[PDB]
Amino acid sequence: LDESX
Amino acid sequence: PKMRLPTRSDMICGYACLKGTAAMRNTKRGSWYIEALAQVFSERACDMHVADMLVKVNALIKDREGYAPGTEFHRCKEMSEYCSTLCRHLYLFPGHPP
């Protein structure tokens, strides 16, 4: 799943 | 009277995302940017200079979109960029000499 930095 | 240098030069910096935005990372595949960087550099360092490889990375990032249903990240985007004070082509010439 994509998450942010 | 000898040739002198600016205080900073000959650098290239690749950023995973643009000013003001979030960079995207996949819990299993890692960051979109690093994944793309490794794919392009491994296959093209043999015949493409670094700034041009970063353009290929930009193309990959522009074409990807987020997968995270139920969150603000589903179908979200990001765009990478690079800034350069390089003064010549930067070829890594991998494996030469053998």
Partner: protein
């Protein structure tokens, strides 16, 4: 992951208009990855950051660089160790340098695991012509995997 080698012919027809880049190693590379945080807690565990770290270490080694690694460092540790790295004597005999920083961040700065910031301008300064004479006129590559704000790009429909 495998790096295709360039051919002798490619080198002969391109080395004249490019930066000198034939030293062995090609240069030193530093991969600094911060994955575990909590200082201001808005700094969540960077799941997948381990894959990024391993991928770059392997890539840079295959590209002919001597790789240095740093994991889960505070802002002060990053500053001190980046300076130590920039001052290493090997840079005189190599032809280029690579620095990859992977962590959480804000515009113009990256977070240490302590939730404190290290300004990127201070990082680039450590490798400039004044502070790092050993890399004068040599190509210095930086790759920064870190957020530059909290806006998530929603994307736009193509017309």
């Amino acid at each position: 992951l495998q790096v295709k080698p360039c051919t002798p012919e490619f080198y002969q027809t391109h080395f004249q208009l490019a930066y000198r880049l034939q030293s062995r190693p090609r240069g030193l590379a530093l991969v600094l990855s911060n994955v575990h945080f909590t200082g201001e807690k808005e700094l969540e565990f960077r799941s997948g950051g381990d894959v990024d770290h391993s991928t770059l270490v392997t890539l840079f080694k295959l590209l002919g660089y001597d790789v240095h690694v740093l994991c889960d460092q505070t802002a002060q540790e990053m500053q001190e160790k980046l300076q130590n790295f920039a001052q290493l004597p090997a840079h005189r005999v190599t032809d280029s340098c690579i620095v990859a920083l992977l962590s959480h961040g804000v515009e113009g700065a990256i977070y240490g695991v302590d939730g404190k910031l290290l300004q990127l301008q201070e990082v680039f300064q450590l490798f400039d012509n004044a502070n790092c004479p050993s890399l004068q006129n040599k190509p210095k590559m930086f790759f920064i995997q870190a957020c530059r704000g909290d806006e998530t790009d929603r994307g736009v429909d193509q017309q």
